[PDB]
C-alpha cells in the first residue's frame, strides 16, 4: 500500500536524516551519499515500505 | 572496540559513524579486518560505560 510521495521546489537538507532522524541503514544505489547538494534530483519519488 | 551493528562500516570505500567521526579505512586498504565477541570480557552488568 505504498505512497508514492512528489517533492518539488525545495532543497536536499538531507543532513538531518543521518542524525535528526538517525536511521541505522543508508545504502544509496546508482548516486553514492555525500554529494547531494548540487545536480541532484529533478522528479524525486519517495516510496514508504 | 565496537558494537555489535559495527562490523559492517569496517571496509574500504564504506561510510557511516565510524567513517565520519570515529575512523576512515583507505579505500586502497591491503589488510584483514578480524573481529570476536567480547561479551565475557568488555562488558559490565550495568554497562560497560567505559
Redesign the interface.
Known sequence: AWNRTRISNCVADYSVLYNFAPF?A?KCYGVS??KLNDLCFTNVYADSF | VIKG?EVSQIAPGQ??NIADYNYKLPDDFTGCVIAWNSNKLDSKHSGNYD
Open positions: 541505522f543508508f551519499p555525500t | 551493528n561510510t557511516g
